[PDB]
Design an enzyme around this catalytic site. Sequence first.
Site, PDB file in Angstrom:
ATOM      1  N   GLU A 168      44.758  44.110  30.039  1.00 55.82           N
ATOM      2  CA  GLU A 168      46.142  43.913  29.616  1.00 55.82           C
ATOM      3  C   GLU A 168      46.411  44.474  28.226  1.00 55.82           C
ATOM      4  O   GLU A 168      46.630  43.709  27.281  1.00 55.82           O
ATOM      5  CB  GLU A 168      46.484  42.423  29.680  1.00 55.82           C
ATOM      6  CG  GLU A 168      46.105  41.814  31.000  1.00 55.82           C
ATOM      7  CD  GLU A 168      46.984  40.651  31.383  1.00 55.82           C
ATOM      8  OE1 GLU A 168      48.211  40.815  31.474  1.00 55.82           O
ATOM      9  OE2 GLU A 168      46.449  39.555  31.610  1.00 55.82           O
TER      10      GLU A 168
ATOM     11  N   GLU B 170      42.519  38.563  38.133  1.00 66.75           N
ATOM     12  CA  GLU B 170      42.775  37.235  37.589  1.00 66.75           C
ATOM     13  C   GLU B 170      43.826  36.535  38.435  1.00 66.75           C
ATOM     14  O   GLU B 170      44.857  37.123  38.778  1.00 66.75           O
ATOM     15  CB  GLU B 170      43.252  37.290  36.139  1.00 66.75           C
ATOM     16  CG  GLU B 170      42.162  37.471  35.107  1.00 66.75           C
ATOM     17  CD  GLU B 170      42.709  37.497  33.691  1.00 66.75           C
ATOM     18  OE1 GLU B 170      43.587  36.651  33.380  1.00 66.75           O
ATOM     19  OE2 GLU B 170      42.269  38.362  32.894  1.00 66.75           O
TER      20      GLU B 170
END
Lengths: 461, 461
Positions: free
Chosen positions: B165, B365
């Site tokens: 990210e 995730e």
Amino acid sequence: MVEFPEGFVWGAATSGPQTEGNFHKQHQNVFDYWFATEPEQFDAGVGPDTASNFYNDYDHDLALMAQAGVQGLRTSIQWTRLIDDFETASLNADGVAFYNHVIDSMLAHHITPYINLHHFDLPVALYDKYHGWESKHVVELFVKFAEQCFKLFGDRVDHWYTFNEPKVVVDGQYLYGWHYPQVINGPKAVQVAYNMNLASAKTVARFHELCVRPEQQIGIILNLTPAYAASDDPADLAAAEFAELWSNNLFLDPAVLGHFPEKLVERLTMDGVLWDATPTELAIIAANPVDCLGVNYYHPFRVQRPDISPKSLQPWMPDIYFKEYDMPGRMMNVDRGWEIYPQAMTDIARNIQKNYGNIPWMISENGMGVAGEERFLDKQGVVQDDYRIDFMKEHLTALAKGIAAGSNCQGYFVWSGIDCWSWNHAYHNRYGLIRNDIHTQTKTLKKSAKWFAELGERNGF
Amino acid sequence: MVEFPEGFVWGAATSGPQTEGNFHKQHQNVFDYWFATEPEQFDAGVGPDTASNFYNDYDHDLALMAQAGVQGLRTSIQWTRLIDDFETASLNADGVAFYNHVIDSMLAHHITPYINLHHFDLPVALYDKYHGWESKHVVELFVKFAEQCFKLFGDRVDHWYTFNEPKVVVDGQYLYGWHYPQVINGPKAVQVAYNMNLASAKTVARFHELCVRPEQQIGIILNLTPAYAASDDPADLAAAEFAELWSNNLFLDPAVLGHFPEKLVERLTMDGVLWDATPTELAIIAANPVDCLGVNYYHPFRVQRPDISPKSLQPWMPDIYFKEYDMPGRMMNVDRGWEIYPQAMTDIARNIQKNYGNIPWMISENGMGVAGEERFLDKQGVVQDDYRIDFMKEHLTALAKGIAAGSNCQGYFVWSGIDCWSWNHAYHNRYGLIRNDIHTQTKTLKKSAKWFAELGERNGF
């Protein structure tokens, strides 16, 4: 009798390390360390520390060059003078003031600046810490240096060069002991040659990102002496073509065509000594060829079969494929030990037009060295260097066949304007249009200076 | 009843800074410094200096995760642990020995390593000296560190990720105050987002020069939550359009398609906030898309028109084009402030399948956080975390829809395996299949752990 195209540039060529002296210079280049450590390796023990006093007398030196008819002067900025911290490329204030004083003074005397970024003058500390041109990091540090020059002088300098003859750095530093650190290792020399072409393409890219005007061009300076075969015997032809690829195509092809010569790549691959390249690096080479091309020529090069088979058990060297040949009948400059052969001018001119798209190019170095020029002083202390006049007439006449047959040759630069320091040979041989009495740094035009000034007015002879 | 393709990978996801502790770590990252100087900014005063003690307890910790059905563990290597001199990327010897132990221990417990190179852990010295990700030089230091990871661990690691990210670094460090240095500067964040996409592409290039197997693949981890329009009114569709380009396309298009989204580039240019790029850089980005994708998802994201016109006088920020929207009737995880909407999983799968070549990808995730899980301890010290099973069930059921429609999803990693340090929130919310009592570092499986193990053996539920 011989005329040159309109707008032809009549120029002279030096470098910063061969002229400035080391006055107040922050860092040592490899030659300064060499000289400070082994002065016995230098003719008459004259090192670069004073050279031709250009740090101190640049203004009056430029006045004399303009009288000799220097319309454009090509010299170089020393990495070791401009830069404080190499990792960062921060500025040494006195060095910045010096080069601006020089450039401004050139424009005050109507001399067009031709700035080259590197002339055999690697900082010794980068060799000590990374082994210099073997290190892709050092390649990056050079680009950072080059950016600082573009930002500081690009407003006044239109004509730029990345390197003067990388092959001499390759040969001198890694093959033949000519340059400190005097390493003798073929495989490293191959890697260095690649890394310098890569440094070059990267600098062209950085330049085109920052250049604002159409007038702004960046080129590279190469010696394109052909490799003439000794005979039509097949082994001599095989030796000539490798030596052609090794000495010229190694840098001409990547700089102008964007790729290395595939026959050369094939041969280094098979011999197990190919450089380490990445796809990104190769793509950078392909995308950033030079705008123009500076050509250096002094004396021809002839080759024959090697004495022993290149399969022999021996350390790899480019020389396993060729040996130099002395030609019976050759016209000679006897004291310097060089053949005189101005038709090479014409062959070079034609290679460029036929096989390199007739890219804009100039003769960036041509000249003749003579020792003890005080033998030919007349009674007002002017060297009667008629030999140098004759030399220039022979090579320019062949260069004009060059241009008449189509060469996009745009100027002619003499080595040199003022007698300058020729590395280990120091001031043994003088090349200048202008004599320097190096004991007093007193400079006097020679006869060739006035002939060169009228050459530029007549645009011919 | 709900089953998955043959060879689907069932994994857990953490990162190094959230698990190891700072034991004998040579350098501070941004969060180490932030905690060391402002511990009041961290929940219950808990920083990263011990975290979940993984530096000391990796062997037994890896045994508990295997007990809980972790077939593939995704974690990260810290720049600040592996590297002695950032400029040279020379090795810290304890750091190399630790990650070798961890990787070797993973194999001995039959856990496939998935190695991420960067998880919000910029070395703080590179921020102080270069301003971190703003510096294209820091980008080059990152590539050097990535090369060391490949060289040291590539022999036993096949699955790599450049970053986790990047958008959270852009947002956290340069937009909204979440991460030290807590800069609030729209234009800087645009440049940072460019630089990290560049750093990822440069890292894909170095990986492929050095990868020696077909199995070896590198990718990037992105949150791909759709930006749901609050309504079908034009102003809400336009906001959702921009939030989608800015949230996902900014990293997905460069990473998978090799170019930035031209609508976004048009908008940033028109707003005068565009990054500084070079032709060379854009070509590297074009030439090195990732091998695979890793997709992070916890809660949806919905968007309506801004309160005020984007032509208003305010500092440029991405948010000027869109405001977060709270849907009435939303299913909420109330304590955390997040909406529950597993349908997004299906939407994500379809977007990858239909607009990104169905490139190989995984949910890297997904997971639910719950504070104070002592409330649900039983006789065993086993958290009765049925809510986390329900959460997993619901989001897996949506994933299987995406898969059956043909989306090339190949695995699913729970966040997390063991309770880990969640930045400023530290240990307030617990996500692990395995509980950590952080006073004693005593780790005990939860109920959801046994279930994850049964989910693996059955490849379904």
